[PDB]
């Protein structure tokens, strides 16, 4: 769901970044209100995500090679397919009788990603899928290339499509390097609604601005709002304006001709109660981008797992079910607490 | 003294405009808690019927299967949601879908080339066949009873012109959508209204009268038609406070910002309900009041538990 | 990817207004503001939905591997 910023430099066109839009123009209310909007946490409309807001997808590619052991055709023996029948015929639920999954297939970790037969084992064996989440098989690509003959098609590259829904903890940022995770997907009814009849897509807390001095974001809000109402792009090149031609006046007057608060606020009502909020809320249209770092995906838990044989201590890595390190500083710190029974 | 009948004495409605798709109506002399209840319910709680289980048989298109499923969910159907009850979960999917609880829409499109477009570009619609996949392509598949039942309410996409997908020759889509009953609260796809919002009647307290060119000069400070001047030698008056947008632009100027107050009428509510087409907005409102009452009946009906 | 079905913020169905709008900028040689005014996108939530759209699918579609080239 890609869009072209309303507010841009003219080099946005001159460098064509419009070919590859990396974000979208969102309705933002600059408001602390919900109590989950502090410091680095911002709220999205739940129904907005349900309408597809920031929906993104992640592709993972796999190379299944079998020529790594090569060494004089001779004993090469694995062919995708079956031989012993003794395999669970439920493997057909995902893999065609040639050993490759039906393009489009839903796969979950543990499901077979392909099926093959090695004469040495006289068995139909499979390479299992290892992931934290289910995917769908997007492409199956047959590689006989650079080979001398290899006609048995022993190398296949399979591309998986893993959907990435906007979710609590996923990082989001404006064009101002003011990044924050979505703390919660607020129900649309619970959002505040303007007398214009709308409730924002994203809410950013005002107290974030005073340290950051992200006032470019304020002008981006007032210009993107003006440019949507009058319906034209606005130039954001540094110093197109001047101390005697402020953008707040240019877009402010343009907005007032439009029919909206010169300061850009709009009287909104609390979704919950319904009273008019104390003041007119600063609302605008800001290009927001979803960072690839869904560190949300970085969650990990291990109550049991593998251990290194040289220590019999938890192995490493989220994908390895590894265990986080209690380092020296955490050891010392726990001694600080006196928690010696916790330290042991 | 206060009784609910003294409210009935005090409560008023004024309907400005009733389109079969838009309703602009006012509730005078009510509580905000009630208007917010209706609004909130109209948004999340009014049940609607929407695609829920899309069964693909083939999709070779350059559009992501999951995404297309979401888009098919998003299409609002012109369906009286009362033709179906809710589908439970206590039971297997084979029991989930019956002609009593589910409506099926089939989509079978095969893209071709067209027999030879002149020129150059030639319009993908000219160069290709069925390049544009629209909601109008949802063939309705009744079963038995409702087959008869829709004789005079057949299933139609509420907007056939919605572009659903764009294909290329050799791409094909065969899928069977299962449209079910859902609430605007469980997903925005079940919201029967696009926008249900209310605004309190702005109150324009003229502190001292203004006249002449300051009266018309003040009049142009507000939405065109809110402030009326009859003579202006004596006052600049308010033709209609309902026309105002509360831009508070007048406050930029002391010529006026010291002789006027901008408030609201806490009792008077200007509702704006726009329908997604499934139902006329007033009909949706009727469901909102009967729904809230039904909930109070449920709470009377409930046994005090412990 | 493709013109969104509904305006994320508002909820108004918007997918019907794409081709006519593009036609109206072509056929009616209109301006974006007036075109959207005739299309009824009288909210900036609905204004922005179409105004900002980038129907990149036309660029995707030229990569269709299911036809010879």
């Amino acid at each position: 769901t890609g869009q072209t910023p309303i507010v841009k430099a003219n080099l946005y066109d001159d460098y064509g970044m419009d070919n590859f839009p990396n974000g979208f123009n969102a309705v933002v209310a600059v408001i602390s209100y919900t109590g989950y909007d502090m410091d680095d946490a911002m709220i999205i409309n739940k129904s907005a995500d349900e309408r597809g807001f920031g929906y993104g997808t992640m592709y993972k590619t796999e190379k299944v090679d079998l020529a790594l052991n090569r060494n004089r055709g001779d004993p090469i023996t694995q062919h995708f397919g079956f031989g012993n029948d003794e395999w669970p015929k439920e493997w057909l639920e995902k893999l065609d009788e040639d050993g490759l999954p039906y393009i489009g297939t839903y796969v979950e970790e543990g499901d077979p990603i392909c099926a093959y037969f090695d004469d040495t084992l006289n068995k139909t064996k499979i390479k299992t899928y290892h992931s934290s989440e289910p995917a769908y098989i997007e492409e199956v690509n047959l590689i006989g290339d650079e080979s001398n003959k290899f006609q048995e098609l022993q190398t296949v590259s399979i591309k998986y499509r893993i959907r990435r829904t906007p979710q609590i903890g996923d990082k989001f940022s404006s064009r101002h390097g003011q990044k924050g995770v979505c703390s919660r997907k607020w129900p649309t009814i619970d959002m505040p609604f303007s007398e214009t009849g709308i409730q924002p897509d994203i809410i950013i807390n005002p107290h974030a601005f005073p340290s950051r001095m992200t006032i470019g974001m304020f002008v981006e809000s007032l210009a993107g709002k003006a440019g949507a109402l009058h319906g034209i792009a606005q130039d954001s090149t540094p110093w197109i304006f001047n101390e005697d031609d402020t953008p707040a006046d240019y877009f402010g007057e343009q907005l007032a001709k439009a029919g909206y608060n010169y300061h850009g606020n709009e009287p909104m009502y609390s979704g919950a109660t319904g009273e008019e909020l104390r003041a007119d809320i600063y609302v605008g249209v800001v290009y927001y981008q979803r960072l690839r770092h869904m560190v949300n995906d970085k969650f990990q838990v291990r109550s049991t797992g593998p251990v290194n044989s040289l220590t019999m201590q938890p192995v490493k890595g989220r994908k390895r079910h590894g265990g986080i390190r209690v380092g020296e500083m955490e050891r010392d710190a726990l001694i600080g607490h006196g928690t010696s029974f916790l330290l042991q | 003294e206060w009784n609910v009948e003294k409210f009935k004495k005090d409560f008023e409605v004024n309907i400005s405009s009733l389109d079969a798709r838009e309703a602009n109506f006012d509730l005078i002399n009510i509580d905000t808690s009630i208007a917010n209840a209706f609004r909130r319910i109209m948004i999340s709680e009014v049940p609607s019927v929407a695609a829920e289980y899309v069964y693909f048989f083939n999709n070779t298109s350059v559009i992501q299967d999951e995404v297309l499923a979401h888009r098919i969910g998003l299409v609002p159907l012109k369906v009286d949601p009362d033709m179906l009850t809710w589908v439970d979960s206590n039971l297997p999917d084979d029991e989930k879908f019956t002609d009593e609880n589910t409506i099926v829409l089939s989509l079978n499109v095969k893209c071709t080339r067209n027999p030879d477009a002149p020129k150059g570009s030639t319009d993908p619609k000219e160069l290709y066949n069925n390049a544009h996949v629209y909601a109008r392509d949802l063939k309705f598949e009744p079963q038995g009873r409702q087959s008869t039942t829709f004789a005079d309410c057949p299933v139609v996409p509420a907007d056939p012109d919605i572009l659903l997908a764009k294909l290329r020759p050799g791409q094909e889509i065969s899928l069977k959508a299962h449209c079910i009953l859902g609430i605007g609260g469980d997903h925005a796809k079940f919201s029967p209204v696009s926008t249900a919002s209310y605004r309190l009647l702005p109150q324009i307290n003229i502190l001292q009268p203004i006249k002449g060119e300051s009266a018309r000069r003040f009049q142009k400070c507000f939405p065109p038609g809110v402030i009326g001047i009859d003579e202006g030698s004596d006052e600049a008056y308010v033709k209609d406070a309902r026309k105002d947008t509360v831009s508070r632009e007048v406050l930029r100027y002391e010529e006026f910002a010291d002789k006027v107050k901008l408030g609201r009428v806490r009792n008077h509510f200007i509702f704006n309900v726009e329908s997604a087409g499934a139902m006329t907005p007033e009909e949706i409102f009727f469901k909102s009041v009967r729904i809230l009452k039904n909930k109070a009946e449920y709470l009377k009906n409930c046994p005090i538990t412990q | 990817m493709i013109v969104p079905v509904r305006c994320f913020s508002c909820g108004k169905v918007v997918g019907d207004k794409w081709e006519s709008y593009l036609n109206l900028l072509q056929e009616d040689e209109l301006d974006e503001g007036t075109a959207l005014s005739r299309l009824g996108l009288k909210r900036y939530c609905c204004r922005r939905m179409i105004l900002t759209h980038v129907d990149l699918i036309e660029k995707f579609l030229r990569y269709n591997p299911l036809e010879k080239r």
């Binding site: 034209i232 304006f241 | 400005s16 939405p223 | -």
Partner: peptide, 24 residues
């Protein structure tokens, strides 16, 4: 320096609910 020009189609883009440009 020249000031960035203001737009010519500088006209009302908002109405009350219930109203239109038939009053504009």
């Amino acid at each position: 320096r020249k000031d960035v020009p203001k737009v010519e189609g500088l006209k009302l883009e908002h109405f009350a609910t219930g109203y239109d440009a038939e009053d504009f």
